[PDB]
Nucleic acid binder design. Sequence first.
RNA 1: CCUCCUAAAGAGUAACGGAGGAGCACGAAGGUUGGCUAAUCCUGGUCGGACAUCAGGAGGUUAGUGCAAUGGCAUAAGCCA
RNA 2: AGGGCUACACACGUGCUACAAUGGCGCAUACAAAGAGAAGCGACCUCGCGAGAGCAAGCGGACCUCAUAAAGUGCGUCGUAGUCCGGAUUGGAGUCUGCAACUCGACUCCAUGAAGUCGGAAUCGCUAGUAAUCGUGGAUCAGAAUGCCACGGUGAAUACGU
Lengths: 177, 67, 82, 95, 116
Amino acid sequence: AKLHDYYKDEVVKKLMTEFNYNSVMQVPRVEKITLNMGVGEAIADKKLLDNAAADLAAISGQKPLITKARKSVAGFKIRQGYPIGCKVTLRGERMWEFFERLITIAVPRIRDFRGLSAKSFDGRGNYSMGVREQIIFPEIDYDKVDRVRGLDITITTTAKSDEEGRALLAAFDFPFR
Amino acid sequence: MKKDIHPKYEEITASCSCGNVMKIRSTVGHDLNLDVCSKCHPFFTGKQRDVATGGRVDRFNKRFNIP
Amino acid sequence: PRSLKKGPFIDLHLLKKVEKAVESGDKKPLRTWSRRSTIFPNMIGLTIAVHNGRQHVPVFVTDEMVGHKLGEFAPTRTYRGH
Amino acid sequence: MQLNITGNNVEITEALREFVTAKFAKLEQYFDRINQVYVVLKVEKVTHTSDATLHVNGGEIHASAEGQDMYAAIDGLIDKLARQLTKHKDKLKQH
Amino acid sequence: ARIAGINIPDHKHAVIALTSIYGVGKTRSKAILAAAGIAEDVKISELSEGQIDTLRDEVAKFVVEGDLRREISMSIKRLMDLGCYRGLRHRRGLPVRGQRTKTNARTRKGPRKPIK
RNA sequence: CCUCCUAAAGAGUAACGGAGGAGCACGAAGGUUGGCUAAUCCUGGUCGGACAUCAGGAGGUUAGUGCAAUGGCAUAAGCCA
RNA sequence: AGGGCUACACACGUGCUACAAUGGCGCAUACAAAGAGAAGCGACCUCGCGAGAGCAAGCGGACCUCAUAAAGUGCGUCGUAGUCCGGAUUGGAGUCUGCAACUCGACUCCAUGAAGUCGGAAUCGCUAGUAAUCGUGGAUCAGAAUGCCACGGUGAAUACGU
Ligand SMILES: [Mg+2]
Ligand SMILES: [Mg+2]
Ligand SMILES: [Mg+2]
Ligand SMILES: [Mg+2]
Ligand SMILES: [Mg+2]
Ligand SMILES: [Mg+2]
Ligand SMILES: [Mg+2]
Ligand SMILES: [Mg+2]
Ligand SMILES: [Mg+2]
Ligand SMILES: [Mg+2]
Ligand SMILES: [Mg+2]
Ligand SMILES: [Mg+2]
Ligand SMILES: [Mg+2]
Ligand SMILES: [Mg+2]
Ligand SMILES: [Mg+2]
Ligand SMILES: [Mg+2]
Ligand SMILES: [Mg+2]
Ligand SMILES: [Mg+2]
Ligand SMILES: [Mg+2]
Ligand SMILES: [Mg+2]
C-alpha cells in the first residue's frame, strides 16, 4: 500500500491544485496493470510457453492466464486456438505493491539506463512499456534461467487526456527521459 | 483471490548499497542485497552527463601550445 | 605521428597564405599541394582546394577538421567496384 | 580441372580466353582426375606457340605446339595432350 | 557477483573475473585489486558484501560498458561524417590502418564472395 | 436428391436454359441451466515483422453458423462453462 | 611539385603465427657460438609504466660497446573451457627516424578480443649432430624483415628390402 497510501494524500492533493479539479473524483487514478508476454516459439515446442508462465508467476505473485490465437494466420503458421502467450491482470493491494517494486528495484537494473520514454502513451493516458530481459526482476534467479525473455507492461488509467496521465505517473517520481 | 494455485507472496527485506532498506512483498522468499535502488542511481539522482563533443580545437591548443 | 615536442607541422607557403585569408578577409578557394600540412584553427571557415594527384578538390574546413592533414580529405585512387 | 592462362608477348582477349577454355574442356573425357593446369602463349617474331602443363592424379603432363596462328597452335596442342593423357590412364587401369 | 550492472563469474580468481567487465583489460584488473586493496588469488565467491562494494567503487573510476560502447561509436560516427580516408575505410568496411587488400584482409571483408 | 434464377408480387410451371451443391458428419457438434458478444481499422507497446499475444479507442454484425445456396438468427439459432 | 608502383568481387605460389596442458601466466635460476662498430658502437647515472629522453665513461676493439641467449630448471597457479588457448581487427593515448610519416613507417601503453577444436581430393622436405624445435648475428639500411645470408642450444624416428 506504500504508494496507495502515498497516492491517497500526497499525489491526489498535488494534482488537485495544478488542474483545478473541483470534484476529487476528477483526479486520475491508476486502474490496473497487465503484463503480457507473447511466446510464438510455442508452436515449435509447448514447454517454452509454460516456462514463461513460471517466470510471470514468479515476478507477479499470481498464476497467469494462457492466451490463445483469436484467428488463424498463415503468416506465422498458427491456427485459431493454439496457446501463444500469457498475461496477468493486477488490480489492488498487489497492483500497488508490484508498482512499488517496479520503480524502486527493477527498473534501475536496466542494462544501461537513460530513464524511460515519455512518448509512449496511447492518446487517452495509459502507459505502455517493454523490458528486454527478465533478470531485471530479482524475483528470478539469473543462474537458473533457460532463455532471455521479455514482457510488455501496460498501466491502464482513468486519465482522460494523454497529458493528464503523464502527471499522475511523474507524481510518483516515475523515471522519464 | 483463488486458493492454493498462486505462489507464496510474503514480506522480506531489501537492503541497498546506500543503507536504504525497504520491507516489501515478493515471491523471492528471502532477503535481498541489491546494489542500485532508486536513490543510488545516476539517472534518478541527476549525475549522467552526455559525452563531451567539440574538443578538436580545445584539444589542439591544449596539446601543442604553439604561436 | 610527429612527436609532440616538435609541434604541429605546416608548410610555410601555405601557413603564410592563410594570414591574408584571415586578416585581409577574402572569400576565394586556395590551391595547394600541401597534403602534409595539418589543419590549424585559423583555417576554420575557408574552403581550400588540395591536390589529389591530378586535380585539386575543395575542403570547406570546419571545427571537426582540426589536427588532421589536408590530404586526409583528397582521395587519390578511383574505385567503383568489379 | 582448374585453368590458368598467361601471355608472354600476347594480349589475352576474350576470344582467345573463351576459345582456349572450350578446347581444354574436352581433355577431361580422356582422364577424369585432372587438377590445376597452366597455359602459356608466345609470339617470337613469326612463330606462334602454345604450351600447357597439367597437374594430374599422380603425374605432370606437358606439351607445346607451334602454329601459323595461335588458334592453329592451340588446336595442335590439344591433340598432343590427348595422346599423353590416354597413355597415362591406361598405365593405371592396368589389369 | 554483480558489478557495473553485469554478472561476474564467482568461481574465478578476482583478477580473471573482473576482466569480464567490458573496458577493463588485465592491467586495470590488477590495479583495481590493490587500489581497493583486495587480493588477486581470492575467488569472488569467497568475499564480503563489503569487499564487493569498495570494489564496485574502484570500477566506477573508469568509463566502462554502455558508457564506453557509446564513446567508441561516437568516434567512428565522427570519422564517417568527416568523410576522411579513415572514415571511408570504416564505411566500405576495409583495413583502416594501411594493410594490404590485394590478398588477405578477410577480417574486415569477411568470408569469400565467389565470382559469377 | 438439395439451393438460387428463369416463374409473369398465393401454389405450381418447360428447354441438350443460366449458376452451384449432396450420396455425410457429430455421445457432443444432442438435452438443460448459468454466463457471454462479432468483423475490421487506428493509437501505444520485449523479441514481433502488413499480419501472433497485451492495453486503449473508433466501429456496430461489414462477424459467426461442421459442409452449397437461400431464408433465418441478439430472447441470439453465434461463443464458453 | 603532387600522385602512382601499397589499388581489391577474385585465382595461384612461398612463408609466419596459431588452434593449447610434452601447454598459458607469475616469481626464481643455469649453460653458447658467430658477428658488427668512427663520427659509428654508445656503458654508468637521472628521468619515464613503456617505446624512449637527458647527461655523457670507454672503445678503430681477444681490452670498450652492442648484449641479460632461449628453449631448460625449481616453486606457484590455471584444470580441458572457444578457456588465464589464440592475438587478427578497431578506438583512444604516445615515442622515434626523417624537410615530411594523410595516401604509405617501426615501435609503445590503455581498451578491444575475430577466424581458428589439427585441415577433402591431392601434395612437399628430410637418412645424423640430419629432421624437429629454441634463441643469436649480419648485409641492404636516415627509418623501414615473418624474407635472405650466417651462428650455436636441445636433439629424435626408421631403412626388412627392390
Ligand atoms: Mg583439331
Ligand atoms: Mg593489452
Ligand atoms: Mg410464385
Ligand atoms: Mg403469379
Ligand atoms: Mg408443360
Ligand atoms: Mg428445366
Ligand atoms: Mg449445433
Ligand atoms: Mg441460455
Ligand atoms: Mg502490433
Ligand atoms: Mg479493443
Ligand atoms: Mg456477413
Ligand atoms: Mg444449441
Ligand atoms: Mg617525383
Ligand atoms: Mg611490388
Ligand atoms: Mg611453422
Ligand atoms: Mg593470452
Ligand atoms: Mg646494423
Ligand atoms: Mg625507471
Ligand atoms: Mg641422401
Ligand atoms: Mg629462426
